[PDB]
A = this chain, B = another copy of it.
């Protein structure tokens, strides 16, 4: 496949219904060797099972809130891989109140801090820790959402954090690009899945996308996955600092 020989680390694989899982499947299909991170000892079993589905036994803990863990992640990975070709960043968090209802109601200094720390800072923090072992043609990919560009109900503090994240894609691309490393985001559409505890229902947005997007259908993790695999590959050697919409064209209409 078009990722033959590439070694790729994926973060944020929490279930088989998420974008990271879709990206993992596409990458494995195209010949990549994969490794994964997890958060918390209780969930090592889960990620080991997921990794096993992709022929991988390389799983490592990494709470991106902790500098020491970010550093140890790449020290551990390096014992297996002398170089890293790809990074998929699918990590994001905000306290429930900061992504529900009114923007100001959920705004506190700590809520803001946490959301930006985990959802934005973590991407260039991982990039910086990985940098010495990155191959010259490495590709770093993060996931964003239209709520960074335009105000979407409930998205609130996460929209601020994703805007900072998309800016980090541009600054990272400049910092790492002289070496040859590319940095991009996919602005993904919503996936047809039940929203997690705390997160407001995706129901209305999913229906609205299905009815108004040019393709009249919601995007699937297979589609986001194939786009991600492309960006992680040498097929995309001319593409960097890009935020690519993989959303059935929804961003381009007024619904």
Contacts and interface: CB of A to CB of B under 8 A. Distances in A.
Interface string A90-124: 00000000000011100101001100110011001
A4 B215 CA distance: 23
A54 interface: no
B237 A241 contact: no
Given A121-B112, A164-B116, A173 B252 contact: yes
A2 B234 CA distance: 14
Given A159-B167, A172-B103, A214-B177, A242 B249 contact: yes
A45 to B, nearest CB: 30
A182 to B, nearest CB: 7
A244 B246 contact: no
Number of copies of this chain that the complex holds: 4
Nearest to A242: B245
A238 to B, nearest CB: 3
Contacts of A213: 177
Nearest to A238: B223
A150 B121 contact: no
Interface string A232-255: 001111111110111111011111
B230 A238 contact: no
B159 A170 contact: yes
A152 interface: yes
A179 B1 CA distance: 29
Interface in A151-186: 151-153, 155-156, 159-164, 166-168, 170-178, 180, 182-183
Given A109-B67, A124-B104, A215-B177, A238 B224 contact: yes
B238 A189 contact: yes
Contacts of A180: 215
Contacts of A128: 104, 107
Given A103-B124, A112-B120, A160-B164, 13 more contacts: A104-B127, A113-B121, A150-B251, A152-B253, A155-B171, A173-B215, A177-B248, A214-B240, A238-B248, A239-B246, A240-B248, A241-B249, A242-B245
